[PDB]
Design a protein around this ligand. Structure first.
Ligand SMILES: CN[C@@H]1[C@@H](O)[C@@H](O[C@@H]2[C@@H](O)[C@H](O[C@H]3O[C@H](CNCc4c(COP(=O)(O)O)cnc(C)c4O)[C@@H](O)[C@H](O)[C@H]3N)[C@@H](N)C[C@H]2N)OC[C@]1(C)O
Ligand SMILES: CN[C@@H]1[C@@H](O)[C@@H](O[C@@H]2[C@@H](O)[C@H](O[C@H]3O[C@H](CNCc4c(COP(=O)(O)O)cnc(C)c4O)[C@@H](O)[C@H](O)[C@H]3N)[C@@H](N)C[C@H]2N)OC[C@]1(C)O
Lengths: 408, 408
């Protein structure tokens, strides 16, 4: 009631935050003792599992100053910077506490280095007001043009390339395919405009590297997969585009628990093994759930893969009913957005989650059988999870109509 | 070569970061095993002491999932928000990961609510480019006017109050006193312009509250004293001025180790006990050092008090020799800036530090006996620590001369 902010978190049907007392692996316990399976995982930043013991031991030693203190440089920092450069590439690297701060700092630096006013953007880049706009496809008061992953609009803006400082995108892989990325990179290379890959969510999510070799980013940002939820974001790329980062310093720069969590987590994510385990387990859950709904006439499908997926519901009434039924079974989904299992989502948890889905499907069967997913269902669902337009065939006038329906 | 940023940290005479491989309480250990006494304390954010055991145990349990998960609201968050409001006042409260992020967010929010373009500013508010300017006393490209704590310039701008959204200051108490704050508040009340008290450094520093009852802030920010170095900043104040905070959310909002550090630290800082202990211990060190230098003819005085103080050297050559002698004895000062002891600066550590100061004084004796502390010495020393002009009597023409000397 005192809070001036509106943090994203699980909320009940009345909008009140759901409180959880404790967590271990994939399971959360609520104040009433009920155990829930977490698919939200701090918005995808818990990738190893809640309370992971190896990370916890490193955090605990760091909380006692055993490898360094917040006052000063220590060998842990050298190790972390080297790990980031090895896995993501680039001339130089930088560190931040949030993805929002990293994206603002990098975008300002690139704009300054390029001495150009316009930035073309798709995807969410954090809460800073520099990204706010009243309308898509036109510059906001900060010179940023939201293009909603529409390549026709992008090509239009890139046809006059001399004023375009950069193109910044948060890559989606549920609704954008290989053809989208090949054309995106062709267009940006043709205009000679640097690409900023905002991989806060997808960097290290699917493999031990950035999300797609079909992008050639001049600058990257990663964060959620770096530190099992501890507040660390990293950036890197071409030195001349990041020169202004020399002006960046913050009080908690050397704080040791954050670096302990990042070095320990990154070492495991750099092997690719957690992402392979998550992919297999999540794929099993997706296949079971898709069939459970399809075999009961429930108009809900899924997009994505085991590492990152989402539910696609026929309409908002179906989605609301699904979310209520899922919560009643103790499934904790990121409602209307993407689901991101952690490595603690093992076969035993998959089996538990599938039984809960069987009960969700039972609760919904017979309520919505005469409804079907339409193109509108797909666009609306994708919009909520990846913050722009799915890559489905349409004309320039149809783009305007879809945006008119979905833009708030 | 790898790091694109230039973080503030202790550096040797060649500008290279000093490496410390562990720390505990008031002592840091360098790669050669030598123990130094820390007066920097992560730029004043370690106020209980490195590796404080109560905080460490809480962080460790939080790292094991015992006190909530990053996915959701936890049982302890309400107690954090409630105590922040009890200690600092205000209608509503918000949380951030750095002081830089807090200051940018609240300044943008206040300006938006006031629907006015100009912000008058003194003091450091973080690294964001919105604060960068080429010259003082005139608006930068973001509408920010740096006034260097000069009340004649402030009064001139406040004489056209209709365009002034807010006045944001980082309060200093080494070089600004009752006279300055009484007049600052008189001017801002007369203009009916809200004050943003950037208490990132001084909030909770001197007592269980904000830094001076002579300020009446509409918005406050605290951070360094809140979480023993973990990355937590807090804001609060008038609900309508912070309306835009409803759009603030970030992935790590509920991260449990930060929450454990802030709640455990705030519960202790809210009693006033650490601040009283630091004040007494630091006052003993100041008194000993002032007398040692005065008896040896060493032209170095001190300003401030046990919670936050600085050295005032006659000139840069004296300062350079002082800092080299101090490093040789294992005193780790924040060079040219403020010293901020932690609660680990106990009587035993005071005695050790006084012995090291005895050796510093002996090493400086006879080298600078013919040097006086001028007005130039005081203004230059204060400028480095509190980022503007000390409140010492001066003419308007003298203000121009000082600013011309010290602005870069
Ligand atoms: C007009 N714009 C509309 C807005 O309402 C706004 O909606 C956002 C919504 O996008 C957001 O969800 C997205 O982001 C979360 C969290 N991701 C963070 C992130 C950052 C910032 O990092 P930080 O949190 O500061 O550490 C930077 N870059 C990327 C790629 C990030 O993912 C993701 O978890 C969700 O998957 C993603 N949809 C909501 N959390 C808050 C809403 N206000 O923008 C989109 C919308 C509809 O268009
Ligand atoms: C050449 N011009 C100069 C600028 O470069 C710039 O100088 C700063 C200097 O002020 C800074 O020291 C000050 O700040 C440190 C750290 N305190 C942070 C702080 C914040 C931001 O919090 P965050 O770090 O993001 O968590 C917000 N508000 C306050 C009140 C803060 O203290 C303090 O520890 C020092 O005591 C203080 N002097 C240097 N660390 C870096 C320099 N670049 O601004 C001043 C000057 C003239 O303009």
């Amino acid at each position: 009631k005192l809070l001036a902010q509106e943090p994203t978190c699980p909320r009940d049907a009345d909008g009140r935050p759901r409180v959880f007392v404790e967590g271990s692996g994939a399971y959360l316990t609520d104040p009433d003792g009920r155990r829930w399976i977490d698919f939200d995982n701090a918005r995808g930043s818990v990738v190893l599992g809640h309370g992971d013991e190896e990370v916890a031991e490193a955090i605990a030693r760091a909380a006692r100053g055993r490898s360094g203190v917040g006052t000063a440089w220590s060998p842990v920092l050298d190790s972390l910077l080297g790990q980031l450069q090895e896995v993501c590439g680039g001339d130089v690297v930088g560190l931040y506490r949030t993805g929002t701060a990293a994206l603002r700092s990098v975008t300002c630096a690139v704009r300054d280095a390029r001495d150009r006013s316009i930035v073309l953007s798709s995807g969410y880049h954090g809460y800073d007001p520099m990204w706010h706009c009243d309308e898509p496809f036109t510059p906001n008061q900060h010179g940023i043009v939201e293009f909603l992953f529409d390549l026709d609009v992008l090509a239009e803006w890139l046809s006059r390339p001399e004023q375009v400082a950069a193109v910044v995108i948060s890559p989606d892989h549920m609704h954008l395919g290989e053809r989208w990325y090949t054309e995106f990179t062709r267009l940006t290379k043709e205009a000679d405009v640097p690409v900023i890959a905002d991989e806060v969510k997808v960097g290290l999510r699917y493999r031990a590297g950035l999300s797609t070799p079909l992008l050639d980013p001049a600058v990257w940002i990663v964060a959620k997969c770096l530190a099992n939820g501890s507040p660390v974001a990293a950036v890197g790329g071409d030195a001349h585009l990041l020169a202004a980062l020399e002006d960046v310093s913050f009080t908690s720069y050397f704080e040791p628990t954050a670096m302990a969590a990042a070095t320990t987590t990154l070492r495991r994510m750099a092997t690719g093994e957690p992402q392979q385990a998550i992919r297999a387990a999540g794929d099993r859950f997706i296949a079971h759930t898709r069939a459970a709904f399809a075999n009961a006439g429930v108009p809900i499908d899924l997009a994505g893969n085991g590492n990152l997926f989402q539910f696609v519901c026929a309409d908002d009434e179906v989605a609301d009913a699904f979310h209520a039924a899922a919560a009643a079974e103790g499934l904790l989904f990121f409602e209307g957005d993407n689901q991101t299992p952690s490595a603690a989502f093992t076969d035993e948890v998959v089996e538990d989650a599938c039984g809960r889905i069987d009960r969700v499907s039972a609760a919904l069967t017979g309520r919505f059988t005469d409804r079907e997913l339409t193109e509108e269902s797909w666009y609306a669902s994708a919009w909520g999870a990846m913050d722009g337009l799915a890559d489905r065939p349409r004309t320039r006038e149809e783009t305007t109509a879809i945006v008119e329906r979905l833009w708030e």
